Amino acid sequence: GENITQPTQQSTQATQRFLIEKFSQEQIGENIVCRVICTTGQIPIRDLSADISQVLKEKRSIKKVWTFGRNPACDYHLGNISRLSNKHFQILLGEDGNLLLNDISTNGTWLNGQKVEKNSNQLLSQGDEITVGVGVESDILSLVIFINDKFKQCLEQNKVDRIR
Numbered sequence: 001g002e003n004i005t006q007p008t009q010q011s012t013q014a015t016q017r018f019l020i021e022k023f024s025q026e027q028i029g030e031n032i033v034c035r036v037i038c039t040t041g042q043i044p045i046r047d048l049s050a051d052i053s054q055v056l057k058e059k060r061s062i063k064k065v066w067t068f069g070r071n072p073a074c075d076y077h078l079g080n081i082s083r084l085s086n087k088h089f090q091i092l093l094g095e096d097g098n099l100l101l102n103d104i105s106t107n108g109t110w111l112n113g114q115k116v117e118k119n120s121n122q123l124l125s126q127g128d129e130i131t132v133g134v135g136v137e138s139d140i141l142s143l144v145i146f147i148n149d150k151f152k153q154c155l156e157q158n159k160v161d162r163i164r
Contacts, residue, residue, distance in 0.1 A: 029049070033148075039144055062093075062095075074090075082106075103122065104119050130145075
């Protein structure tokens with residue numbers, strides 16, 4: 001008895017069960033540039049995506065950037081806090097198809113426990129993470145980006161060459 005069949009009278013509902021279905025509903029991210037997951041809780045898992053076709057052409061089509069802060073949802077739509085919360089950081093996509101991270105914060109942006117320069121694009125890293133609001137162990141906020149290897153696999157399958 002692993003599957004479900006012939007349910008007996010026990011509990012009926014069409015609300016809470018629906019939420020569970022969506023959770024299990026796994027979506028494919030082959031064109032989905034990358035997914036950002038804020039573990040600290042500052043920002044909710046937001047899916048970052050881009051057009052693969054743009055990468056194939058490059059130059060002409062390759063300009064997409066995600067922003068976290070006071071926006072209707074640039075990258076994410078969040079409240080308006082004069083300190084850390086507003087346009088607190090950004091993610092850049094492009095440069096030979098690769099991905100870049102732009103740390104935009106008011107006074108301090110961190111990378112894996114290493115304070116960095118503001119509005120400073122960064123080379124994408126596997127499971128990279130940006131920390132913000134440093135000073136007190138109890139007042140630090142973290143940001144993590146989960147890149148889909150599927151996207152990288154596609155680029156490899158479509159290498160550049162002109163040999164007959």
